[PDB]
């Protein structure tokens, strides 16, 4: 089942699937400069992962990024927090509600912290739907 | 002939004629040069600006071409 | 950053020279830091992360 | 290295290829930078490694 | 609590999923890992700075616009105006613009 964000609004989803018929250089000409800085940055990591169609794929992430946070005020932190957030997300997913002790060894975090992590991503895993 | 393979986009024609021709979904030049003048006039809005450009490009309607389209 | 000078100048030290504005000079700094991070001038610099 | 016999011409000596890259290593670094093959000298060191 | 979240990294989390749903929709291998590294680049790219992200469908116009020119077939000017809720002036403008665009494509 196509259960996710573009499921709610196929119109945006179909637009994402329509960029293949339009080549890049003319389409980026009409775009604001900022997303042009995004796409190549998103491209930069992509070829480091040796994934095909770096230009084609990178566009798909950029439009979806603009789709949600378009209209929304978005802040970004930097530094050690990111992999802390990355570690938190893996902990939440690994957390099957039965391997909390396994995570207690996998991530080794204080018990109140684990609840805070578990609670916090729960909010993040509720507003989407 | 190097023009039968080129699409309709190489005419630089008027917007009225451009709108009229594509209402019937024409994509190549050859099918314009295939149909004669006695059926294309039924389309509303055209009769005064095709002959001049066709002569300028060395083409004329009414002639017969076999193996069309050649794909 | 003290490039080609005997010492680096802090935010206060550079404020007394051009402008006492703190956030303004800080955001010009951030402007430069992004402009360097674009993958149009960072290609060569990326090879020095291994050191 | 040990010495072995040569078919060789009078003005030539047989130099092992394994020794040659080590002896001339700065020369390969410079030539490979000049050819523009590696962006930095450390990249060239990686290539010769 | 909202002010506590003001500097919160919650935004970072919200994004991995934003990347997920398109990557999962596009069906690439391994959503999560690709999207997290994908985010880390943005973090380093955009750390500690004011950024205007094109908001409110502005990008989606360009994609809405491309499909509409594709479905413009010369006499359905009413049809695609209902189905996009657009108006005559909008239709005419987009039409002429994409027409010039393709003419630059067919012509050298």
* B26 three-state secondary structure: coil
Given an 8 Å threshold on Cβ–Cβ distance, is B22 in contact with E73? Answer: yes
Given an 8 Å threshold on Cβ–Cβ distance, is C44 in contact with D40? Answer: yes
Going by C-alpha positions, the residue among C10, A88, A61 that lies closest to residue E31 is: A61
C-alpha torsion A120→A38→A71→E85, nearest 10:
-130
Chain B contact present for E107, CB below 8 A = yes
E73, E106, E107: residue with CB nearest B25? E73
* B28 three-state secondary structure: strand
Q: How far is CA B14 from CA A120, B40, B46, B47, in A?
A: 63, 16, 9, 12
Question: Is residue E20 a contact partner of residue E32, using CB atoms and an 8 Å limit?
Answer: yes
- State the method: cryo-EM
Domains of chain B and CATH, by start: 1-70 (1.10.150.20)
Distance, CA of A59 to CA of E62 (rounded, Å): 13
Chain B residues within 8 A of E74 when measuring between CB atoms = 19-20, 22-23
Given an 8 Å threshold on Cβ–Cβ distance, is E49 in contact with C37? Answer: no
Contacts with A, C 18-47, CB within 8 Å: 38-40
> How far apart are the CA of E21 and the nearest CA of chain A, in angstroms?
5
B9, B20, B23: residue with CB nearest E102? B9
Distance, CA of A66 to CA of A57 (rounded, Å): 15
Given an 8 Å threshold on Cβ–Cβ distance, is B23 in contact with E106? Answer: no
For residue A118, what are the contacts with CB-CB under 8 A and spacing of at least 6? Answer: A91, A92, A95
Given an 8 Å threshold on Cβ–Cβ distance, is E44 in contact with C37? Answer: yes
For residue E67, what are the contacts with CB-CB under 8 A and spacing of at least 6? Answer: A14, A15, A18
> How far apart are the CA of E68 and the nearest CA of chain B, in angstroms?
16
DSSP H helices, chain A, are: 5-8, 10-16, 24-29, 33-48, 54-69, 80-94, 100-106, 111-124
**Neighbouring C-beta atoms of residue C18, cutoff 10 Å:** 10
Going by C-alpha positions, the residue among E98, E28, E54, E42 that lies closest to residue A63 is: E54
């Amino acid at each position: 089942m196509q259960h996710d964000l573009f499921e709610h609004d196929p119109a945006i989803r179909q637009l994402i699937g329509h960029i293949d018929n339009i080549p890049a250089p003319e389409l980026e000409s009409r775009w604001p400069r900022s997303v042009v800085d995004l796409i190549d940055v998103l491209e930069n990591e992509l070829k480091r992962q040796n994934v095909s169609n770096p230009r084609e794929l990178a566009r798909k992430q950029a439009v979806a990024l603009s789709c949600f946070l378009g209209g929304r005020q978005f802040y970004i932190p930097c530094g050690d927090t990111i992999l802390t957030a990355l570690r938190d997300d893996l902990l939440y997913c690994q957390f099957n509600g039965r391997n909390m002790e396994e995570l207690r060894r996998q991530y080794r975090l204080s018990q109140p912290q684990i609840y805070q992590i578990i609670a916090r991503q729960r909010k993040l895993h509720t507003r989407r739907h | 002939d190097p023009i039968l393979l080129r699409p309709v986009d190489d005419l630089e024609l008027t917007v009225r004629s451009a709108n009229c021709l594509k209402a019937e979904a024409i994509h190549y030049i050859g099918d314009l040069v295939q149909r004669t003048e006695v059926e294309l006039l039924k389309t509303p809005n055209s009769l005064t600006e095709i002959k001049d450009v066709l002569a300028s490009r060395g083409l004329s309607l009414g002639m017969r071409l076999e193996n069309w389209p050649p794909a | 950053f003290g490039i080609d000078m005997n010492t680096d100048y802090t935010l206060e030290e550079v404020g007394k020279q051009f402008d006492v504005t703190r956030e303004r000079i800080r955001q010009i700094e951030a402007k430069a830091l992004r402009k360097l991070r674009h993958p149009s001038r960072s290609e060569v610099l990326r090879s020095f992360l291994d050191d | 290295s040990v010495i072995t016999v040569g078919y060789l011409r009078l003005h030539q000596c047989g130099l092992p290829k394994k020794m040659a890259l080590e002896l001339f290593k700065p020369f390969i670094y410079g030539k490979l930078e000049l050819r523009g093959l590696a962006t930095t000298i450390k990249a060239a060191k990686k290539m010769v490694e």
